[PDB]
Scaffold this active site. Structure first.
Site, short mmCIF file in Angstrom:
data_model
loop_
_atom_site.label_atom_id
_atom_site.label_comp_id
_atom_site.label_asym_id
_atom_site.label_seq_id
_atom_site.Cartn_x
_atom_site.Cartn_y
_atom_site.Cartn_z
N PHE B 33 66.91 46.41 89.31
CA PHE B 33 66.10 45.26 88.94
C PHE B 33 65.06 45.63 87.88
CE2 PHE B 33 66.50 41.07 90.63
CZ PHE B 33 67.28 41.16 91.78
N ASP B 147 67.02 42.40 102.04
CA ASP B 147 67.17 43.80 101.64
C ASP B 147 66.23 44.70 102.43
OD1 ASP B 147 68.43 45.83 100.17
OD2 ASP B 147 66.92 45.79 98.57
#
Ligand SMILES: COc1ccc(CNC(=O)Nc2ncc([N+](=O)[O-])s2)cc1
Ligand SMILES: COc1ccc(CNC(=O)Nc2ncc([N+](=O)[O-])s2)cc1
Lengths: 345, 344
Positions: B33, B147
Site C-alpha cells: 500500500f 487484516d
C-alpha cells in the site's frame, strides 16, 4: 538397523504384489498431508522415498490413482504402494524414486551465497519442468501446486522430476474446482481472484514464477495476503483491463499502475530470451499464456538443442528429446523444433 | 538537521489547517500500500508515524475516510493528513500523520519465540482484551478491519497499551453486498475466506484475533500453511472436520482426509484461555463470540480485579471507560464489563 518387509503392489503394470524389504529409514520432510521418508531397498540398495498418508477405507486415494497412470522421465516414479497401521488408522504408503535435491534447496544455496544459479541450469530445469507439464496436461491433469519445493533435482545428472501430486486433479470443462490450492507466491491471478473455472494454465503461471525466481534470486510476487500479491503483480504486468479481469474470473479497486518494462525487472546481464519467455508465461489472460509444449520450443532453450552442449561437470545433458506422440499431442508440428537433427539418430 | 514544514488538516474536528514541522524522518516499514515513516515533531519533540500512499486521482482514499471517523484509546489516532509528492513529477501522495507506538505484537512475540519463551499471560490478557475493545468499537460502525495480524497491533512496552493500526483493508460491510475474499494475511484468514466466501461478516476479524491469541499462547502461528489446503488441514486437526452444514454457513466445495484443544497448548495454560480460543475459532461464523462478548469472557476476569497491576508496578491502562457506542451491540454486558470498583 531395523528391516521392514511388506507386500507392496507395483506402481505400474498388473496388480501383482511382491514382498519388498527396506531399511535405513529417515524423515525427509513433514507435510500437511503426511510425512515423506527416505529408505534403502534391501534388494538393490537403491534409495527411495516413502510418502505416508492417512487413508480412509471409504474412497480411493486420488494421488495414488493419478500416479499409477504417469510414466515420464521428468516425473517422480511410483515404484510401489502398500498399506500399514494408531491401529484403527490405516496408512497408504507411496514408494517413489528418491531424488537428492530440490530446486528450492539449490536456489537457497545460491541466494545465500549472494549469487544466482548459472543460466544453463535455469534452462535445463525449466525445460524439463515444461516437459513434465506437457505430459500431465495431455491427459487433462493439472498439478495445481507447482513450486520450487516440488521440483526434484539430481545434482550430478541435471535431471529434474516433478513431485507431490497431492493437489493434482483432472480438470473437466464445466466442472468447478476449488480456488484455494497452490502455494502463496505461485498462485495464478485467477486463483487469487477466486476463480473456480480455471484450467491447466494455472500450472504455466506457477512455472513462470519459478523461472522469474531463479533469474531474480527471490520470489517475484511475494505478499502475505492476496491483495499484497496482486499489487506486486500489477507493478510488473500493469493494471488489468476489465477485459482481462473477466478472463480470469467472471470487484475491487486497484491503483492504476502502468506496466513495468520486463527488462528492468531482472539484472542487466539477464538473457533477452529469458525475459521474453517470462512475459509470455506471466500473462493475465489465461488463454494467452504459452502452453507447456510451446514453452519447451521457445528460443530460451535453443542452447539445450545445440549438439555440443555439455553440463558444467563435464557430463552430457540428460535425455531431453525422447518425446512421445502423447507428449506432443497438443501440437505435433513442434516436433521439428523439439527434436533436433542430431537427436535420437 | 533537515526540517520539513507542511500545512495539514486535523484528523478530527473543524478543518482548521495547522502548520506542522518535523525532522529526523526514517522508514518504519515499507508495504504494498504505502511506506510508513517515523518522524519527530520539532516543537514537542514528540514522535509520530507518517503513512504515505499514492493519491488515486479518481476517488478519495478509503483508509483516510475511515480513519477520520475513529476516536478510540485502542486505535492509532490520525492527527493530521496532507498531500504532496515524493517519487516522480506528477503522482500525488496522501500523508497520514498518526500516533507513533514503540512496538508491535509481531516484534515482541518474535523476541520471546527466539528465546524459546512465551509472553507472560498477564500481557496476553491485556493485549487481547484491548484488541477486542478496538474491534467492538469499529464493528459498532459496521467497519471490518479485514487484516488483523500481529504486525498491525501496536504496543507500548511501558504502559501496556495496545493500539490497532493499518486500516488499508478496512471496509464498511453491508449485508447483501459482495466483498473480495482475498484480503487478510495468510495464517489469520477465517475458513470462509479460504473457501472463497464473498458474503462474510465482521466475524472474520474475530477469527483473526483468535489466531493471534492462540499464537501468543503457543509461541508460533496456530494454523500455518503455504496454501489454503494446508491451512485448512491445520484447522481441521484442531476443530475437526466441518459438518456439511458448517460448510454451508461458511460458504453458500470438495473434500478433506486430530488435536482437541487441551492438547494444543503447554501444560500450565490457563483453562479460560483455552475456552476463549475455542469460542473464537469456530467454523460457523455466527457461532463465534462477538468482540464485546470476548471482553466479558472469564479469561479477562483478572483485569477486572481492583488490585491488578502491571508487572512493572504501574497501573493498567483504562479498560472500563466504555462508551454507549462501544456497548451498543449489547448494553447489558456492561454489568460484567464495568467492575463494581469502576462505578465508585
Ligand atoms: C535431510 O533430509 C532430507 C533429504 C533430502 C532432501 C531433499 N530431497 C528430496 O526431497 N528427495 C525426494 N524424493 C522424492 C520425494 N517425494 O516425495 O516424492 S522427495 C531434504 C531433506
Ligand atoms: C527501526 O524502525 C522501526 C521503529 C519501530 C518499529 C515498530 N513500531 C511501529 O511500527 N510503530 C508504529 N506506529 C504507528 C504506525 N502506523 O503505521 O500507524 S507503526 C519498527 C521499525
Amino acid at each position: 538397523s531395523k528391516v521392514t518387509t511388506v507386500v507392496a503392489t507395483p506402481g505400474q503394470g498388473p496388480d501383482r504384489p511382491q514382498e519388498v524389504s527396506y531399511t535405513d529409514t529417515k524423515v525427509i520432510g513433514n507435510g500437511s498431508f503426511g510425512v515423506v521418508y527416505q529408505a534403502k531397498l534391501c534388494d538393490s540398495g537403491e534409495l527411495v522415498a516413502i510418502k505416508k498418508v492417512l487413508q480412509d477405507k471409504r474412497f480411493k486415494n486420488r494421488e495414488l490413482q493419478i500416479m499409477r497412470k504417469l510414466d515420464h522421465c521428468n516425473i517422480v516414479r511410483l515404484r510401489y504402494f502398500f498399506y500399514s497401521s494408531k491401529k484403527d488408522e490405516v496408512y497408504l504408503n507411496l514408494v517413489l524414486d528418491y531424488v537428492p535435491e530440490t530446486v528450492y534447496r539449490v536456489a537457497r544455496h545460491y541466494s545465500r551465497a549472494k549469487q544466482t544459479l548459472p543460466v544453463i541450469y535455469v534452462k535445463l530445469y525449466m525445460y524439463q519442468l515444461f516437459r513434465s507439464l506437457a505430459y500431465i496436461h495431455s491427459f487433462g491433469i493439472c498439478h495445481r501446486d507447482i513450486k520450487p519445493q516440488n521440483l526434484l533435482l539430481d545434482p550430478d545428472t541435471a535431471v529434474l522430476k516433478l513431485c507431490d501430486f497431492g493437489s493434482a486433479k483432472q480438470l473437466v470443462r464445466g466442472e468447478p474446482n476449488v480456488s484455494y490450492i497452490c502455494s502463496r507466491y505461485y498462485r495464478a491471478p485467477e486463483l487469487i481472484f477466486g476463480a473456480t473455472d480455471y484450467t491447466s494454465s494455472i500450472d504455466v503461471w506457477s512455472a513462470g514464477c519459478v523461472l522469474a525466481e531463479l533469474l531474480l534470486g527471490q520470489p517475484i510476487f511475494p505478499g502475505d495476503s492476496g491483495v499484497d500479491q496482486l499489487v506486486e503483480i500489477i507493478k510488473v504486468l500493469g493494471t488489468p483491463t476489465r477485459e482481462q479481469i473477466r478472463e480470469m474470473n467472471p470487484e475491487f479497486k486497484f491503483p492504476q499502475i502502468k506496466a513495468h518494462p520486463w527488462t528492468k525487472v531482472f539484472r542487466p546481464r539477464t538473457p533477452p530470451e529469458a525475459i521474453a519467455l517470462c512475459s509470455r508465461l506471466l500473462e493475465y489472460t489465461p488463454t494467452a499464456r504459452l502452453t507447456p509444449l510451446e514453452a519447451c520450443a521457445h528460443s530460451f532453450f535453443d542452447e539445450l538443442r545445440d549438439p555440443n552442449v555439455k553440463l558444467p561437470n563435464g557430463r552430457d545433458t540428460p535425455a531431453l528429446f525422447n518425446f512421445t506422440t502423447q507428449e506432443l499431442s497438443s501440437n505435433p508440428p513442434l516436433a521439428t523444433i523439439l527434436i533436433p537433427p542430431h537427436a535420437r539418430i
